[PDB]
Amino acid sequence: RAWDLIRYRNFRTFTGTERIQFNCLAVDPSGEVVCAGSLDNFDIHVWSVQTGQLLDALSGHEGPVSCLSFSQENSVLASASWDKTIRIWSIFGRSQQVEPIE
Amino acid sequence: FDRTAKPVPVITSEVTESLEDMIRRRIQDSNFDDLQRR
Amino acid sequence: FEVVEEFTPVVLATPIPEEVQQAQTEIKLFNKWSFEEVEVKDASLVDYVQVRQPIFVAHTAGRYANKRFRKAQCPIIERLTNSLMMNGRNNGKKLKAVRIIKHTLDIINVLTDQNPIQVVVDAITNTGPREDTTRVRRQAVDVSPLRRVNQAIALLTIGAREAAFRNIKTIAETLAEELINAAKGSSTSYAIKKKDELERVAKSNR
Amino acid sequence: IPTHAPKYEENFNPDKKSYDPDRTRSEINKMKAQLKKERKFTMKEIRKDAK
Amino acid sequence: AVPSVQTFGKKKSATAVAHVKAGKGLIKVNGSPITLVEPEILRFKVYEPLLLVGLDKFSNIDIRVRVTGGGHVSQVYAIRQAIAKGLVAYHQKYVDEQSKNELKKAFTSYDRTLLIADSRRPEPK
Amino acid sequence: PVTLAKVIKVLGRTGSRGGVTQVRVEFLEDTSRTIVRNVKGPVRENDILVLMESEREARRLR
Amino acid sequence: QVDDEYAATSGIMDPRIIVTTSRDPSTRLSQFAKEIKLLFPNAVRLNRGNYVMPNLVDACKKSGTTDLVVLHEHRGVPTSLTISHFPHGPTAQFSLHNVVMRHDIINAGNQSEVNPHLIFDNFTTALGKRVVCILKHLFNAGPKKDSERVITFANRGDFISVRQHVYVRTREGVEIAEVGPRFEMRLFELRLGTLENKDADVEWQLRRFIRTANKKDYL
Amino acid sequence: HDFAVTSSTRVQIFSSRTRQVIKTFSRFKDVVYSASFRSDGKLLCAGDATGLVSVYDSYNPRTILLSINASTHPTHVTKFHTQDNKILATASDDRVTRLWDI
Amino acid sequence: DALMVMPFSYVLKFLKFIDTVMQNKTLLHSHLPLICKNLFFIIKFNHKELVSQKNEELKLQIN
Amino acid sequence: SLKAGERLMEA
Amino acid sequence: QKALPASLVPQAPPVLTSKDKITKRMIVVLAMASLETHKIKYVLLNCDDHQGLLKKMGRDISEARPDITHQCLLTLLDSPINKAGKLQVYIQTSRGILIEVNPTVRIPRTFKRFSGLMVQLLHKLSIRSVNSEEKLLKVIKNPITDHLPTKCRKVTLSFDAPVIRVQDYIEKLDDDESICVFVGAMARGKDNFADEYVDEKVGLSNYPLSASVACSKFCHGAEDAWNIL
RNA sequence: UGACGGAGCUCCGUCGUAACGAGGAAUUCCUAGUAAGCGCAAGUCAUCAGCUUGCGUUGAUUACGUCCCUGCCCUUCACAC
C-alpha cells in the first residue's frame, strides 16, 4: 500500500496474482518501481507505482527472499534469501543481468 | 512374409492437396483450435 | 627499535626448499619476479593493466567473463597466457601456455637484465592503438582503454605466433623478442607496425 | 630467380573427370563408380516398393 | 584423545579430505610429501596457503590429505581448499579465535576460493 | 604531443554508428575545458582517453 | 477440462520454453534447433555443451521455464523430439520422420513472429486429447483474430503432420503459403515426470512388438 | 668453475670436481672456435668456420638464446665484454672485429 | 537528452538567444515555463565550465 | 533524418 | 680496405612470397581484372569472342577484356625487378576473387593459352609446376590487407591525381617499408576500386596511361631507385 | 607447438625441421564451465552402429552496449510530469 502524506491517502495498492504474503519491501530512488519479497513464493515481485501493473517476477532464488534494497546511486537491486546467497539484479537497462554471490 | 510395424508414410502430392484443403476449409470458417486467456 | 613475532627457529617435519621461505618473505611470479617496482608508465593504461595483486602462478580459475569490465581486475600475465593458447590445437591447454610464458620471461631477463614484467607492461602500453578507423570510406575514432589493452595483447600474441609458425625459432623466443622490441618501441615488433599503420590511417581519415 | 612453367590441361572441363595415366586404373574407377550408382539406385527402389 | 579435525575441499568431481591433528609439522598428500604433488608447474598453487600464514603455524600440527576424482587441476584446487579449511578449523577448535580471525582475513584477502567452494552453476539468459 | 581527457558522461540516445559511442570528456590539463568525442571500444565513466587532436568536435557518424 | 499440470496456468501465464540439443550437436541439428524456437513464440535456444541433465532441469526450473525441448539427430538428420513440462511432468517423446527444413528452401526469406493460430485435426481418443493439451500450451494465448500466421497439427494414423502457413483472405476464399518446416511426429513414450527422471512412472508407452502394432491406432 | 674445451665441431664443459664432461654442445655443424663464458657465467658464446656465432645458456645445451651471422668468413674469436654484459665482441677472418649487442 | 548532447560552445549561443528573447517580453510570457526549464538545466549540466570563464560580456548577459 | 538537438544546433 | 665477401659465387635471389613480409618489396595490384568462366566447355569470357553470351549474362562487353590483365602480367613478370626477386603480383577479379601470382611463373605469351590457365585456375583454385615442386598461381583469402607486408605504402594510379615522379617517390620512402601499387586493369571506370584500403592516390603522367604502360613505367623507377639494373 | 622409447598432461633420453603440403569466392553458426581439444562407457520397444546417446578431463578470445544498418513486434488510486 502506497501513501501520500500531503493528503494522507492510500493512493495505490499492489497485490500479487497468487495471493502471496509479503515481508520485505524496497522503493526505487526515482520512486517509479516498487519491489517486494515473500517467505512463501521464492521469487521477487515488482510493480510500477504509476500504473500498478506487475512488471515481472524476478526468479533465481531457491529459498525465500528475506530482505531487499536498491542502490540510491547505481539504481541496482540487492536481494538475499535463506538460500545462502546474495544476488545483485540490474533490472534497469536494455538487458537484465543477475550476479549471485554465495 | 509379413511386416511388423507401421510403414512410414510418404507425403505424396494428393496427400498434400488433401491436407491444405482442410487448412483452407478451417480458416474459411475461422475454426481454430486455439488457446485463450481464461 | 625491533619487533619479534618469532621466538623459535622454524623446522618443519616435511622438508621445504629454502627458496620457498624466501617466497614467504615476498610473493613473486614463479617465485622469481617481483611486482613491487612494476608501474604502468602511461596513465591511461592504469586501472586496466592490473599488476598490484601479486601471484605465484598465472593460473587462478577466476570468474572473469561474468560482467562487462571484470577483465580489468585480471592479472595481466594471466591475460597474456590466455591469449597465447589459440588455434584449436592449443585450445584447452593453459598449462602449456604457462610453461611457454615462464620460458619467455626467462629469455627476456637473460637478454635484458631489467625485470621482464616491466617489459611486458611497456610493450602492452606502447602497442595500444590510441586512435582507429570505422567504416562509414573510413572515419577516425578514439579508442577505449580496455580495447587498447585487449588489442595490444592480441597483436603481441599473434605476431609472436605467426613469426614462429613455420620457423626454427620457438614460441617462447619469438614472444620474448616481440615483447622486447615493443617495449623498446622499435618498429621491428609486428604489433608496433600495426599500431602505427592504424593510427596513421585514422589520421588520414581525420 | 628460378623459372618454372605452369601445368594445365588444354580444353579443361571441371565437370569432366581428371585424366588418368593408367587406362586400366581409370577403367576400374569408372566401373566402381557405376556399380555404386546402380547399387544405391536399386536399394532405394526395393525399399520403396517393399514399403 | 589427540586433538584433531576433519575438513573437505571440492572442485568439480575432485574431492580432498584433510585431517589435521597436533603434530611436528608433517604435511602429506595421498601418503606422499606435499613437495611431491604434481603437476610441478602448479605446485606453488598448493603451496599457496602454506606461504601466506607462514610455516611457523604448521610446526605444531601434522596434516594428511587424501584426494580422489577429477583431474590434476581440480585435484590441486581441492587440496588447497582442504588445507586452508583444515587449518582454520583446527585453530578454531584448539586455538584462540584471534587466530581463526587473521587466518580467515588473510585467506579471503588473497583469494576467497580457499574457503568457499567455487561452483560454476549454470545461469540462463 | 597527445593529450589525455577523462570521460565524465557517456551520452545516450545519440544514434551513433554501431560499435561507436558518443561521449563527453574533460581534459586532465584543464578541469574546465570539456570536449565531445567518439569512441570505438566499450567505455565506462572515469576512464581517460588519449587524444591525438584536441580541436575536432564530434559529429554523429551515420 | 485442461489437465491438472496445466490447469494451474492454463490461460493465466504465458509459457516459457527452452530448446536444446544432444551433446556435440551437428550443424544441421543446431540449424533445426534454430527453426523450432521460431515456431514457438516464447522459445529460447540454449547450447548443450557439457550440460548434465539433472543440472539442466534444475537450472531451467530455477529460471521458471515452463517447458524444455531437446532434439536428437543421426548424421545431420533430425530423428527424435522430446517435450518435458515443469515442475513435475509430463514428458513426451516424439520421433521425427520426413523432416524437411526451411534452410533447404532457397530465397525463403524471413518468417513472421506473431502469436500463431493453431489447428488440431483428427484428435479423438483420450490420449489424443492429452497430446493436444501438451502441444497446445507451448504457444502464447489470445492470438489476434486477423493474425496471418497459422500452425496446424494434423493426425493421420498416429503420424502427426505439422505445417505452418501464412495466409491472405481473398474476396472469394483464402489462400495459404507454406513456410515450413515439414516433418512427422509420433508419440511413443509419455511419463509422469521430468525427462531427467528415468524412474518416472509411465502414463503410456507405444507397443511396437504387439502383433497388432501393424494396424492398431491410438490417437 | 666448470671449464669448456672446444674440440672439432663440439664444446665440452667439464666439472671441476668430477674432472669429467658434464655438458656437451654438438649443435655446431662445422668446427667450433670458441667457448668463452660471460662474466656472470650464465651464457656461453662460440664461433664457427661458417662464421655464425651462437649464444647458448651455460649448462642448458638444448636452448639457443641468440644466433648471429657475424660474417660468411670463419669466426675464430668470440668473447664477452668483461665490464659490460650486453655487448659481445666477434672477430673473424673477414678482418673486421664486429662488436655485437645482445 | 537533446540538450545534453549540446557542446558547451552551443550553450553560449543558447544563452545569447535567451537574452535576446528577454527584450521580446511578449514571447517571454508566452513560453515562460519552457524557457525556465531548458535554460536552467543547461546551467546545471555544464555549471563547471560556465563558471570557469572570465568573459565580461557573458557576465553582463547572465546578470 | 535530423534528430532532437541536432536540429537545434542548426537552429 | 673493406674486406670482400667470402663467397662471390652468384646466388639466386630468394623467391619472395606472401609468407615473407619483412622484406622490402614492390607489390603491383591488378584491381578489377575481368576474368570469368562459363560453360558453352568452360571458356574465359572475352569482349570479342563471346559477345552474345555476355549479353545473355547481362554484363557489358566493354568490361570483358582479360587481354589487358594478360598484358600487365607479361610486362610485370618480364620486368628486371621480377628477375631480381623484389616484386610480387596480386590480381583481384571484378567478381571478388583474389589471385596470388608467384614470381617464378611463366605465363604463356599467347593469350589463348593464358585463357586456358584462367579456367583451370578459377576452377581448380591452384596451379602446379611442370616438375611438381611449387604452386605458381593460388587463389587466396580476401581481404588483400593480410597478405601484404606488415609495413607498406599504398598508392593508386589516378589520372586526376597530381603527377609525381616515381623515382623521387620511392627514394623519399623508407627502406623497411614496401610499396604497393593498385593498377586498374579496366578499360574505363572510376578510380575508387581500392579507395577503402589505400591512403592516397597519385598520378604518373599527365597524358592517359594504359595499365600495361603505367605498371611498366612505375617498376622501372624502382629499378633505377633501388639500383636493380 | 614434431617422431621414437622409458618413467610418473609432467619429466627424462635420441634424432632433427598420379595425389598433396591446412583449403578461394561466397555462405553458416556462436557469449562461460560457452567455443575448442582429449579420452571412457551404454546401445534402454521410436531412431541409431556407414552410427546414436551418455560420462568425465582441459578450457579460452571477443562482446554482454547499440536500434546507426537490416528485419520482427507493440502503442497513439496521490506527488511530479
PDB file of N, CA and C (backbone and C1' of nucleotides) in Angstrom, chain B residues 34-35, chain G residues 36-43 110-118 138-151 164-167 179, chain L residues 71-75:
ATOM      1  N   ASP B  34      -7.495 -23.009 -30.643  1.00  0.00           N
ATOM      2  CA  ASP B  34      -6.500 -22.086 -30.117  1.00  0.00           C
ATOM      3  C   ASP B  34      -6.634 -21.966 -28.607  1.00  0.00           C
ATOM      4  N   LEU B  35      -5.517 -21.638 -27.962  1.00  0.00           N
ATOM      5  CA  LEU B  35      -5.519 -21.385 -26.529  1.00  0.00           C
ATOM      6  C   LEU B  35      -5.839 -19.916 -26.276  1.00  0.00           C
TER       7      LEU B  35
ATOM      8  N   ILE G  36      13.023 -24.557 -34.591  1.00  0.00           N
ATOM      9  CA  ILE G  36      11.964 -24.949 -33.663  1.00  0.00           C
ATOM     10  C   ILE G  36      11.639 -23.806 -32.710  1.00  0.00           C
ATOM     11  N   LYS G  37      12.654 -23.051 -32.278  1.00  0.00           N
ATOM     12  CA  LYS G  37      12.366 -21.912 -31.412  1.00  0.00           C
ATOM     13  C   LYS G  37      11.486 -20.908 -32.136  1.00  0.00           C
ATOM     14  N   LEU G  38      11.744 -20.702 -33.426  1.00  0.00           N
ATOM     15  CA  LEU G  38      10.977 -19.724 -34.181  1.00  0.00           C
ATOM     16  C   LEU G  38       9.536 -20.181 -34.350  1.00  0.00           C
ATOM     17  N   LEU G  39       9.292 -21.490 -34.248  1.00  0.00           N
ATOM     18  CA  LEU G  39       7.923 -21.995 -34.248  1.00  0.00           C
ATOM     19  C   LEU G  39       7.171 -21.549 -32.999  1.00  0.00           C
ATOM     20  N   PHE G  40       7.807 -21.660 -31.826  1.00  0.00           N
ATOM     21  CA  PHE G  40       7.168 -21.330 -30.554  1.00  0.00           C
ATOM     22  C   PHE G  40       7.520 -19.901 -30.151  1.00  0.00           C
ATOM     23  N   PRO G  41       6.540 -19.019 -29.925  1.00  0.00           N
ATOM     24  CA  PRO G  41       6.884 -17.596 -29.749  1.00  0.00           C
ATOM     25  C   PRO G  41       7.822 -17.314 -28.586  1.00  0.00           C
ATOM     26  N   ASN G  42       7.685 -18.030 -27.469  1.00  0.00           N
ATOM     27  CA  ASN G  42       8.477 -17.772 -26.270  1.00  0.00           C
ATOM     28  C   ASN G  42       9.583 -18.807 -26.075  1.00  0.00           C
ATOM     29  N   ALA G  43      10.196 -19.259 -27.162  1.00  0.00           N
ATOM     30  CA  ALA G  43      11.270 -20.235 -27.084  1.00  0.00           C
ATOM     31  C   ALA G  43      12.629 -19.550 -27.146  1.00  0.00           C
ATOM     32  N   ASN G 110      12.450 -14.252 -44.479  1.00  0.00           N
ATOM     33  CA  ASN G 110      12.229 -14.271 -43.042  1.00  0.00           C
ATOM     34  C   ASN G 110      10.764 -14.526 -42.714  1.00  0.00           C
ATOM     35  N   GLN G 111      10.547 -15.120 -41.549  1.00  0.00           N
ATOM     36  CA  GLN G 111       9.227 -15.511 -41.088  1.00  0.00           C
ATOM     37  C   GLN G 111       8.569 -14.379 -40.305  1.00  0.00           C
ATOM     38  N   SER G 112       7.303 -14.594 -39.966  1.00  0.00           N
ATOM     39  CA  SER G 112       6.588 -13.735 -39.038  1.00  0.00           C
ATOM     40  C   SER G 112       6.573 -14.378 -37.657  1.00  0.00           C
ATOM     41  N   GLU G 113       6.613 -13.534 -36.627  1.00  0.00           N
ATOM     42  CA  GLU G 113       6.715 -13.978 -35.242  1.00  0.00           C
ATOM     43  C   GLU G 113       5.467 -13.561 -34.455  1.00  0.00           C
ATOM     44  N   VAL G 114       4.331 -13.425 -35.146  1.00  0.00           N
ATOM     45  CA  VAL G 114       3.091 -13.111 -34.449  1.00  0.00           C
ATOM     46  C   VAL G 114       2.557 -14.365 -33.767  1.00  0.00           C
ATOM     47  N   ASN G 115       1.830 -14.150 -32.677  1.00  0.00           N
ATOM     48  CA  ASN G 115       1.192 -15.225 -31.931  1.00  0.00           C
ATOM     49  C   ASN G 115       0.328 -16.067 -32.867  1.00  0.00           C
ATOM     50  N   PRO G 116       0.680 -17.325 -33.131  1.00  0.00           N
ATOM     51  CA  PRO G 116       0.063 -18.047 -34.245  1.00  0.00           C
ATOM     52  C   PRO G 116      -1.376 -18.467 -33.982  1.00  0.00           C
ATOM     53  N   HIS G 117      -2.052 -18.805 -35.073  1.00  0.00           N
ATOM     54  CA  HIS G 117      -3.286 -19.566 -34.986  1.00  0.00           C
ATOM     55  C   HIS G 117      -2.971 -21.055 -35.044  1.00  0.00           C
ATOM     56  N   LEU G 118      -3.736 -21.833 -34.287  1.00  0.00           N
ATOM     57  CA  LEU G 118      -3.452 -23.243 -34.068  1.00  0.00           C
ATOM     58  C   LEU G 118      -4.613 -24.091 -34.561  1.00  0.00           C
ATOM     59  N   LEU G 138       2.267 -24.884 -25.489  1.00  0.00           N
ATOM     60  CA  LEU G 138       3.579 -24.330 -25.812  1.00  0.00           C
ATOM     61  C   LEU G 138       3.486 -22.907 -26.350  1.00  0.00           C
ATOM     62  N   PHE G 139       2.326 -22.503 -26.856  1.00  0.00           N
ATOM     63  CA  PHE G 139       2.183 -21.234 -27.558  1.00  0.00           C
ATOM     64  C   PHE G 139       1.504 -20.189 -26.678  1.00  0.00           C
ATOM     65  N   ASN G 140       1.677 -18.926 -27.064  1.00  0.00           N
ATOM     66  CA  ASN G 140       1.039 -17.817 -26.370  1.00  0.00           C
ATOM     67  C   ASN G 140      -0.441 -17.740 -26.716  1.00  0.00           C
ATOM     68  N   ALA G 141      -1.212 -17.155 -25.805  1.00  0.00           N
ATOM     69  CA  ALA G 141      -2.662 -17.115 -25.918  1.00  0.00           C
ATOM     70  C   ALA G 141      -3.160 -15.825 -26.550  1.00  0.00           C
ATOM     71  N   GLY G 142      -4.442 -15.838 -26.895  1.00  0.00           N
ATOM     72  CA  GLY G 142      -5.123 -14.673 -27.397  1.00  0.00           C
ATOM     73  C   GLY G 142      -4.536 -14.179 -28.702  1.00  0.00           C
ATOM     74  N   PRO G 143      -4.321 -15.077 -29.663  1.00  0.00           N
ATOM     75  CA  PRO G 143      -3.765 -14.631 -30.942  1.00  0.00           C
ATOM     76  C   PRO G 143      -4.738 -13.683 -31.618  1.00  0.00           C
ATOM     77  N   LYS G 144      -4.197 -12.620 -32.205  1.00  0.00           N
ATOM     78  CA  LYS G 144      -5.049 -11.605 -32.803  1.00  0.00           C
ATOM     79  C   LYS G 144      -5.882 -12.226 -33.915  1.00  0.00           C
ATOM     80  N   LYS G 145      -7.159 -11.837 -33.968  1.00  0.00           N
ATOM     81  CA  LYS G 145      -8.105 -12.512 -34.848  1.00  0.00           C
ATOM     82  C   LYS G 145      -7.643 -12.472 -36.296  1.00  0.00           C
ATOM     83  N   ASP G 146      -7.037 -11.365 -36.715  1.00  0.00           N
ATOM     84  CA  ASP G 146      -6.514 -11.213 -38.063  1.00  0.00           C
ATOM     85  C   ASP G 146      -5.037 -11.576 -38.160  1.00  0.00           C
ATOM     86  N   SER G 147      -4.480 -12.230 -37.140  1.00  0.00           N
ATOM     87  CA  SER G 147      -3.107 -12.705 -37.224  1.00  0.00           C
ATOM     88  C   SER G 147      -2.958 -13.639 -38.419  1.00  0.00           C
ATOM     89  N   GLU G 148      -1.948 -13.382 -39.243  1.00  0.00           N
ATOM     90  CA  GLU G 148      -1.818 -14.049 -40.529  1.00  0.00           C
ATOM     91  C   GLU G 148      -1.081 -15.379 -40.466  1.00  0.00           C
ATOM     92  N   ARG G 149      -0.542 -15.769 -39.316  1.00  0.00           N
ATOM     93  CA  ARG G 149       0.394 -16.877 -39.262  1.00  0.00           C
ATOM     94  C   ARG G 149      -0.272 -18.036 -38.529  1.00  0.00           C
ATOM     95  N   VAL G 150      -0.314 -19.208 -39.171  1.00  0.00           N
ATOM     96  CA  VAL G 150      -1.098 -20.337 -38.679  1.00  0.00           C
ATOM     97  C   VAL G 150      -0.232 -21.588 -38.641  1.00  0.00           C
ATOM     98  N   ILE G 151      -0.403 -22.377 -37.583  1.00  0.00           N
ATOM     99  CA  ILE G 151       0.236 -23.679 -37.422  1.00  0.00           C
ATOM    100  C   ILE G 151      -0.862 -24.723 -37.301  1.00  0.00           C
ATOM    101  N   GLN G 164       3.044 -25.113 -41.312  1.00  0.00           N
ATOM    102  CA  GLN G 164       2.993 -23.750 -40.813  1.00  0.00           C
ATOM    103  C   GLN G 164       2.921 -22.799 -41.996  1.00  0.00           C
ATOM    104  N   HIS G 165       1.799 -22.086 -42.101  1.00  0.00           N
ATOM    105  CA  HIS G 165       1.448 -21.316 -43.283  1.00  0.00           C
ATOM    106  C   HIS G 165       1.229 -19.856 -42.919  1.00  0.00           C
ATOM    107  N   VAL G 166       1.298 -19.004 -43.937  1.00  0.00           N
ATOM    108  CA  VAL G 166       0.876 -17.611 -43.853  1.00  0.00           C
ATOM    109  C   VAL G 166      -0.188 -17.394 -44.918  1.00  0.00           C
ATOM    110  N   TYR G 167      -1.316 -16.810 -44.521  1.00  0.00           N
ATOM    111  CA  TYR G 167      -2.496 -16.750 -45.369  1.00  0.00           C
ATOM    112  C   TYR G 167      -2.865 -15.310 -45.697  1.00  0.00           C
ATOM    113  N   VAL G 179       5.497 -22.142 -45.352  1.00  0.00           N
ATOM    114  CA  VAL G 179       6.738 -21.515 -44.914  1.00  0.00           C
ATOM    115  C   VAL G 179       7.704 -22.590 -44.435  1.00  0.00           C
TER     116      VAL G 179
ATOM    117  P     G L  71      14.945  -4.388 -44.398  1.00  0.00           P
ATOM    118  O5'   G L  71      14.528  -5.860 -43.959  1.00  0.00           O
ATOM    119  C5'   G L  71      13.278  -6.109 -43.336  1.00  0.00           C
ATOM    120  C4'   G L  71      13.390  -7.213 -42.318  1.00  0.00           C
ATOM    121  C3'   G L  71      12.238  -7.322 -41.334  1.00  0.00           C
ATOM    122  O3'   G L  71      11.133  -8.022 -41.877  1.00  0.00           O
ATOM    123  C1'   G L  71      14.295  -7.441 -40.169  1.00  0.00           C
ATOM    124  P     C L  72       9.639  -7.473 -41.673  1.00  0.00           P
ATOM    125  O5'   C L  72       9.258  -7.965 -40.210  1.00  0.00           O
ATOM    126  C5'   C L  72       9.277  -9.345 -39.886  1.00  0.00           C
ATOM    127  C4'   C L  72       9.144  -9.562 -38.402  1.00  0.00           C
ATOM    128  C3'   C L  72       8.060  -8.756 -37.710  1.00  0.00           C
ATOM    129  O3'   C L  72       6.766  -9.307 -37.873  1.00  0.00           O
ATOM    130  C1'   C L  72      10.055  -8.610 -36.464  1.00  0.00           C
ATOM    131  P     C L  73       5.478  -8.348 -37.852  1.00  0.00           P
ATOM    132  O5'   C L  73       5.354  -7.921 -36.325  1.00  0.00           O
ATOM    133  C5'   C L  73       5.212  -8.908 -35.317  1.00  0.00           C
ATOM    134  C4'   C L  73       5.447  -8.344 -33.940  1.00  0.00           C
ATOM    135  C3'   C L  73       4.544  -7.197 -33.524  1.00  0.00           C
ATOM    136  O3'   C L  73       3.253  -7.622 -33.124  1.00  0.00           O
ATOM    137  C1'   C L  73       6.773  -6.682 -32.956  1.00  0.00           C
ATOM    138  P     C L  74       1.975  -6.681 -33.381  1.00  0.00           P
ATOM    139  O5'   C L  74       2.040  -5.622 -32.194  1.00  0.00           O
ATOM    140  C5'   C L  74       2.043  -6.054 -30.843  1.00  0.00           C
ATOM    141  C4'   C L  74       2.352  -4.922 -29.899  1.00  0.00           C
ATOM    142  C3'   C L  74       1.494  -3.677 -30.045  1.00  0.00           C
ATOM    143  O3'   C L  74       0.235  -3.795 -29.409  1.00  0.00           O
ATOM    144  C1'   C L  74       3.770  -3.058 -29.873  1.00  0.00           C
ATOM    145  P     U L  75      -0.970  -2.817 -29.820  1.00  0.00           P
ATOM    146  O5'   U L  75      -0.490  -1.382 -29.324  1.00  0.00           O
ATOM    147  C5'   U L  75      -0.472  -1.057 -27.942  1.00  0.00           C
ATOM    148  C4'   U L  75      -0.112   0.390 -27.723  1.00  0.00           C
ATOM    149  C3'   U L  75      -0.972   1.400 -28.463  1.00  0.00           C
ATOM    150  O3'   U L  75      -2.186   1.673 -27.782  1.00  0.00           O
ATOM    151  C1'   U L  75       1.316   1.948 -28.740  1.00  0.00           C
TER     152        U L  75
END
